[PDB]
Structure 1
Amino acid sequence: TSSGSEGNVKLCSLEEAQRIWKQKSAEIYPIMDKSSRTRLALIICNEEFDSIPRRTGAEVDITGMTMLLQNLGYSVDVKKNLTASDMTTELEAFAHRPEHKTSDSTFLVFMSHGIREGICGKKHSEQVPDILQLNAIFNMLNTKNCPSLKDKPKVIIIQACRGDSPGVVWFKD
């Protein structure tokens, strides 16, 4: 059955769930009551850019990821075609959402063009860079800026190039 809330995500049986709490003791992140908990996720996807080419197919990634994160129990916020300044504002706002207090974890997902230095905002070009740094995301989600998410896993996912190279070398078989 895959018509339920978890969809195509394979369920974890109660026998397997308690056998996982046997392999490792208090070395697992605590999970909140399914009843009361208010899990938040956030996807920022840039498809339409001013100068750099269009990311045809990003919609399938937005669809796929959103559905997956919902299956895992998160309320997915989807944001699109933002500048590095705009992304900061939205990351700042997500860090201020009250639901984190009644949450156990979060997922941040960024899908855009990227360079060696960071993630590209909608208005990016080689002459006028519009870049969000990996550093910025962490800084904005740490204990100083996001105290609600203290002691709770924060999972950041980035789909992007990190440079121009194909990342391959040849060798004799």
Structure 2
Amino acid sequence: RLPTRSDMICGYACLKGTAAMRNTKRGSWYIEALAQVFSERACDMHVADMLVKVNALIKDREGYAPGTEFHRCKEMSEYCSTLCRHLYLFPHFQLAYRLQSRPRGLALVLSNVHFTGEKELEFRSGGDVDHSTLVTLFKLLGYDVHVLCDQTAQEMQEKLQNFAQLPAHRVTDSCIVALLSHGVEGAIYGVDGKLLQLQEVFQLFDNANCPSLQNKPKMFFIQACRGDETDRGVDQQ
């Protein structure tokens, strides 16, 4: 018998209280680093170690925008993990999760970029770059990629529950969900300005509501703010 929630790992563009940076040309700092790391290293490095390389890149980057409050600002990513084995994706077999099915799993990419103005939420310029980057990466890593753009909080909950219940999970070895939106600490915005709690999202995939993904790695990437301020950084002693 199993705990209610297990075998999950979650990557965050930023730390509690802080905000995530986005480049209006290139996309978010985090997706750009995440895609760069996974592309080059998925053949010989497990996911946890790989999010450590991503942490390394994010920690060295700084903002460039002379004039604005964003000049030289900083960012720190993080990951939180309940995995119980290595996650090698295999694009070592013995002490790592079974990851051998074709496709490797279903993957969902859920970008909110355009906002209907019910609250004061800005156009996520560069959001289209993030979205494309993740769909190609997940398709290259062997995943059946579902996508979903510009949803309300209600639509998001309902279709994320749909995605969790799909029969296809019975026959695959892993799962991936990537949420890119405006957010607050513990929740992200639908395009209608309404919030969705991340706990509820993770709940829809746990061992009690999503028994078809029991004991297989589930992988959440969350590109949203967790605060209202910017990080000016510290100098090095």
**Short-chain TM bin:** 0.7 to 0.9
Q: 1:91 — aligned with what?
A: 160
3-state SS of 1:132 partner: strand
CA spacing shift, 1:97–1:38, aligned 2, 3 Å:
farther
User: Displacement, 1:167?
Assistant: 3.1
Q: Which of the numbers 222, 226, 229 marks the counterpart of 1:162?
A: 226
Gaps of 5+ in 2: 1-37, 45-88
Q: What is the aligned residue count?
A: 150
User: Displacement, 1:27?
Assistant: 2.6
Q: Distance in 2 between matches of 1:101 and 1:43?
A: 20
Q: Which of the numbers 97, 115, 125 marks the counterpart of 1:49?
A: 115
Q: Which of the numbers 149, 174, 188 marks the counterpart of 1:119?
A: 188
User: Displacement, 1:165?
Assistant: 1.8
Deviation per CA, 1:60-92: give whole Å up to 9, x if none: 111100000011111111101111111111111
Q: Which of the numbers 88, 98, 106 marks the counterpart of 2:175?
A: 106
Q: Distance in 2 between matches of 1:114 and 1:31?
A: 32
Q: Distance in 1 between matches of 2:161 and 2:220?
A: 15
Q: Confirm or deny: 8 A CA contact 2:101 2:173 kept in the other structure.
A: no
1:131 matches 2:195: yes
User: Displacement, 1:38?
Assistant: 6.3
Q: Which amino acid aligns with 1:137?
A: V
CA spacing shift, 1:31–1:171, aligned 2, 3 Å:
closer
Q: Distance in 2 between matches of 1:49 and 1:123?
A: 7
Gaps of 5+ in 1: 1-7, 125-129
| Identical counterparts, % of pairs | 34
Q: Which amino acid aligns with 1:157?
A: F
Q: Which has the larger radius of gyration?
A: 1
TM-score normalised to the size of structure 2? 0.58
Q: 2:150 — aligned with what?
A: 81
Q: Confirm or deny: 8 A CA contact 2:176 2:220 kept in the other structure.
A: yes
47-56 or 99-108: bigger deviation: 47-56
Q: 2:43 — aligned with what?
A: 12
Greater relative contact order (Cα < 8 A, sep 6+): 2
3-state SS of 1:77 partner: strand
CA spacing shift, 1:78–1:148, aligned 2, 3 Å:
same
3-state SS of 1:75 partner: strand
Q: Which of the numbers 100, 106, 124 marks the counterpart of 1:32?
A: 100
CA spacing shift, 1:33–1:108, aligned 2, 3 Å:
closer
